[model samples]
Target: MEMEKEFEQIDKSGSWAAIYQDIRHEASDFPCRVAKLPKNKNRNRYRDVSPFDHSRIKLHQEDNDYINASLIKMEEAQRSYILTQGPLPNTCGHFWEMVWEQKSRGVVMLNRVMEKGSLKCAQYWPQKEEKEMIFEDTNLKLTLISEDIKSYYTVRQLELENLTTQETREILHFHYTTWPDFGVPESPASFLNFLFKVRESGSLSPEHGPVVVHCSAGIGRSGTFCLADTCLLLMDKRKDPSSVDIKKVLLEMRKFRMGLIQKADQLRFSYLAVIEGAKFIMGDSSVQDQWKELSHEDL
Candidate 1:
């Protein structure tokens, strides 16, 4: 009960703010000069958020070779994830190029295209009717083969083709619809169910290059998803699952990407999600049962 007590006491004290501050102060400050280049400047969704030059995913054959994406690797979890912002209209070609070159199996989108009056992301793919899209600049084509919808998420099967080489691959598009910015899912069940859905496809395993994960800014919700997934995985590998320090792991992830787990509340959500996932991983049927019925209330 000590861990529960620690969490309860910390929750009661509302010290996530203090903890968040610590993570911020301890986060890496590596320079990302590549993102500052005149040609690449417009590719960024937000001027304040840019990937470090050291870890930023480069676009091959492109003279500029820049995209607003970061590669985060957790060797202990045997996981590698590419975290990025929503694709800008101009950068969609580069986006596909990165996915192909990186050999990623899926695109894990954590935010919607529009949030209220603001536009969070550009519509990069042809949905349903259009069926096919071609990127002349990058010589890539995207075709929406099938779409499966859920209350809070939608999984689309896409065919990505390299026009230059005629090489094609199936790319899974996992879109989580209801997660709000600076917030989290209604429950870990909804989030976990979606996660398991991605896992069931075997696209998230180490055999793949890395899942391309992103939100509007590509840091907040995207970061939370990566943190929870990585922590849960580390727990599965550890004999004493609870031995992993959540903050320590987060601090490690932050080094790869800036401002992951944006709010203290999001960090709190990551903690609870890991605990909930641990229960399921330890053979609790009830937790898995919750994944079956998704409440259609929130959007």
Candidate 2:
């Protein structure tokens, strides 16, 4: 409760305002290395969308290769994430191709196929009751094994196969269904539960390849999720909730991908979530129980 009050003061005092401005200033120089390619140009959902050169993931195949994704590594937290934009119609194949090539164990999707009346993401996965979806362009097929639908999210077990290599891997699809574009979730409790569910799967660990995380533009909600998770990891490792500076951690993360923590409100929400999560990490039984109750209700 004290930490929440401190964060509230931080919000009212305009601390995040300054940090938001600072991130935007620093992002002005972030490079877009692959935007010039004529073949890959239209693959981006937003004309302004581009991956930072330093952390951008390159395709292994020479022919018909491109994906707007970046590999962000947080050594201290021992987390590696593939932050990417929602797959476009033309880039759906490349999206799967990146997953196959990177050997990713899971995909954390934070957006729905459509929001309001606008298209937020393409239907890249196999539909309900459908066995598989084939992306002929990338020579990949995704077969759904099982699905557990909740009030706000869906957990799916999928089999991703490379048609050419005849090799397949089981991937967990953690699809968050209720989060809106340009917004935060209803509460940190639900988001934290969803995050812990992903963590329980061992997909975000160092043992596997980067876990692919994407929202609409791949920076706003995606960035918030990574930042909160990383901060929680740091608190857990150090055994000191106050040791990590949420703003500093986010600035460091933005070096891997531009436009991270897009809005001032998003930055505010990140601090709130981190503080709420810190309580759980510090062994507060009430907060932990509250999260569990919220999660159970949603399920």
Candidate 3:
């Protein structure tokens, strides 16, 4: 509670940017080895996006065992999440391999396949009309059973089959289509709605290995989602909306991956969303529609 009170005082003084910069400075002292691994040269979508060596998730495959992914665990909340970049053309099989290897039950994609005429992520899932798609590298096949389209999101029922083991598992894909490439969501209400949808599926539980969360680069939007989710959980558990230190949560998540909550606006939006979500949790229904008109505002 003391931490929360101090954070509130700092926030009141309009020092959120200063505090965020301080956090980023502190993170620089932490080791970053995203470029250290030779195999990562082949895995990363951008040459600049690499996982920190210490927390990077290494594949356990016998031969080829490299993927650019990080495992972030919120122990208090019992949430294990994998933050990763969108799969490149060459790494699509490796992407599915990580899924099969990690036994992930759900994949939360925050970026579209293409953004602003540039490729952000490959269409990794099977097509509904085609019924299935195969990954030759991993010898895995994906079948799309159904897809339910919502106003700003899509829920897909997919079946992942391992041809080698002849074992199969159903996976849920929650695709958020409205989020911009580098910007926050239009409103926290829609974003929170999507977050709750994933939560409702029990995909974020510890019983599952880890829920896979990705965006184009995997740090900006993904970090915002994880930070807000964890802060809201802590607030709910403590029964005090202002008791959670959101900046602290972002720094902790950044330890698992680099440059989380990348921009000042993203950081600020995380706070805004957490505040809004806390209010909602405390039975404030009015905030639900409050975010719908957040467009073109100075977020």
Candidate 4:
């Protein structure tokens, strides 16, 4: 009722603009000197959006430690997330190296490689026919072992190998193909299904470094995903679910990253997702079946 209550009030008062401004003011900004440097300039997809130096992820490579990535740690909810821009051509190798050294088990991609006639993200991973992609800089090879396509998303199994050691690990690539930039999904149900597919993998657990979550610039869609996820985790875990303050959670997450939930609509969707997921988490398992009926892959 708390989440739904806040959702109602947000609509009734038309105060999303106020709340959005307040949250942004509170999160403020920090210096990203590394990202702004002339040498590291091209690593960023968007000039205006940069990771906070205090929490950005540094690649193990000594020469160039910069990557357009921020590490968000939620100790309260027991989640660690790496939010980043889509891999640029040169930085794609760093993307995998981060995944490899961090021991991340899954990559939660929230956008298509190309969207609305623009290349939002590079084709970082291999497609079906191209089973192997070797990143010469990092000497990492990605082998596409399997693919599962749904109407709105694609799940791929990729084997990442450290060519130096020939050591390999399997990572799940969850591509939410329909999430548009600057907007949320059509319904939280589809997004939740996608979220839970990763949840069921247990990849978001504390055992791994962090699940790599990205869109084009990484803030808009990535922020929505992390915000909803942390709120629902707190809602399901805490004795008093009402005490789970969604706004405050967003504030804390913003400390690690920046510009989370880009649009007011994204904040609205976060509420919808947390509220919808709470129903299923709090005991209405039946709603998932209703959702399954709506999903296209009945066969």
Candidate 5:
């Protein structure tokens, strides 16, 4: 048998340090030290906030989570739900707590948040050989919405939908949000649009959420958007002077709650968006020109 070649390794060099320096210089407003929720916090914060509160803010403190600029539809009422990458764990008591809480609150069906591109959620085309195979294998109760390759829903993938219901529902169609653009905010803006659309047509109110969004780990972008919404709303409410102190707000958000956004760049983008959102919501132009104009647009 031929052995794999041993790769020659380079000696210790400051290439990484140099690269980091370049990154820091290029993105000086990076948010580094934000707090987050424990893997399983004591309480499911998502469901903990009352639907009647009329406060768009929800603090999933046990989960170290927070959300603002959103109204809570009754849990018993059908709103919308988004699935990230894999199946939600059976041990997701917290998950059910929130889901049922929403339902109990009068939200029956969740509006199901969908993704923009083929990053996490898969698309469903019309009934065809491949489509049928994928659908059958997926064990979902979805149907062909369009003849195009991009429209399908998983009705049920699991054997059990609800324990209370004798008719078990396992397979389910999962909706997702748009992919995070890293340092960019356009993607989330689009997601916000989608969320609001769903709310308008499908649920109690036409606003961003009451829609549940989650990624694989349930932190990064989920936390970022949630945190950003909350902090920016708070800033609007408090009328804090706009500055790079947004980072300070980011830190406090995580500490006061928990998992806002974990990645530094993601949180920073959220922070930047918060500034812009604040301007739109509160009409404060303190940081208007703070954002550099797009070189392409300027031309």
Candidate 6:
């Protein structure tokens, strides 16, 4: 009621301009700014490095104002698909269309899988009572079933599909959950264990390439995860992953899709997760012997 009252009394004339200024100021604190989607290219054609098509200009006109990025390219036969927002009744199809329309046109072979639930915002995954309608729309390839998708057993179980697939795969999933605490909250070891399982299971490409990540409004937990994962990939690719522009990355993600985690602490969490993950693996003893080892020939 207070919000409604405030809205009623608000001046609508300068609102758009003020909103633009706020976004502009916020944009300064990102690693990747709005980017244009790359043109079509083949394996030998050399496509753009970042994922997703379209830049900020067009995204602003959309309802969500979200950004997109590709962790793997098309023609690569990776059947990975990710959804950042919670599962709604019929929104999945539209969301899937926007996500796949870019790559589906390409030579890539993709299987869809949608992960649901909102992290901090209740509005995006706003509670709805159309269970029958919602379940009916679940895309087998895109829908992942989990008591808690964040848990390792569930996340790992779902991610395993990418590894055991008949064709090469890219495992894409979205997370909109936040611990409320900016610092990485103590999640079940299963969560981190899932990452380890994925690593040991050899589901990821040595290229580290990138992973599609997002959350409700495409900010907060999603932003932190994206930055943290990117840094980890960099560390593996290069000797040091310290030189990372998390601020820019979140901004770019937002430009593609508005409201990506924009808080200072969430961005910081990305780095913390990287360190924690490193420590978890490095200090691990009992499982150290079980770690998977692969040769260049495996590539």
Per-candidate local distance difference test: 0.85, 0.83, 0.80, 0.87, 0.34, 0.34
> Lowest lDDT 10-mer window, candidate 5?
1-10
Best-fitting candidate, scored by lDDT? 4
lDDT of 1 by residue, 59-156 (tens): 88737888999999898899999999999999999999999999999999988888877889999877974769999999999999998887888999
Superposing every Cα of model 6 onto the true structure, what RMSD results? 14.9
| Estimated TM-score for each candidate | 0.95, 0.92, 0.88, 0.96, 0.39, 0.43
- Candidates 3 and 6, the one with greater lDDT: 3
* Candidate 3 C-alpha RMSD relative to the actual structure: 3.8
Which residue segments of model 5 deviate by more than 4 Å? 1-94, 102-177, 180-188, 191-211, 239-245, 256-259, 283-299
Residue 245, candidate 2: Cα error in Å is 1.0
How many clashes in each candidate?
A: 0, 0, 0, 0, 49, 30
Write one digit per residue (lDDT tens) for candidate 3, span 152-193. Answer: 788898988999999999999998888865567646778887
The lDDT-based order of candidates, best leading, equals: 4, 1, 2, 3, 6, 5
Which stretch of 10 consecutive residues in model 2 shows the poorest summed lDDT? 27-36
Candidate 5 per-residue lDDT, tens place, 1-299, comes to: 00001001101342333432443344312221211234423222232211112322333335433322123222222232222221232223334333333331112121233334323322322234234322222222322322211121122222222333333322222333225333444433443332323233433233323445455334456555444545544554555534324444444333322343445456445544554455545564443333322211110
- Listed per candidate, the RMSD to the true structure in angstroms reads 1.8, 2.2, 3.8, 1.7, 15.4, 14.9
Question: Could you give candidate 4's per-residue lDDT for residues 52-114 as a string of tens digits?
Answer: 999999999978999999999898888889999999999999999999988999999988787
Q: Model 1, stretches more than 4 Å misplaced? A: 1-3, 295-299
Candidate 3 — which residues are off by over 4 angstroms? 1-16, 28-35, 283-299
Task: Please say which candidate is ahead in lDDT: 2 or 4.
Answer: 4
**Candidates sorted by TM-score, best first:** 4, 1, 2, 3, 6, 5
Q: In model 6, which regions exceed 4 Å deviation?
A: 1-53, 56-84, 98-153, 156-212, 245-258, 280-299
For model 2, the local distance difference test gives 0.83
Name the candidate that leads on TM-score: 4
The regions of model 2 sitting more than 4 angstroms off are 1-6, 297-299
Error of 3 at 114 (Å): 1.0
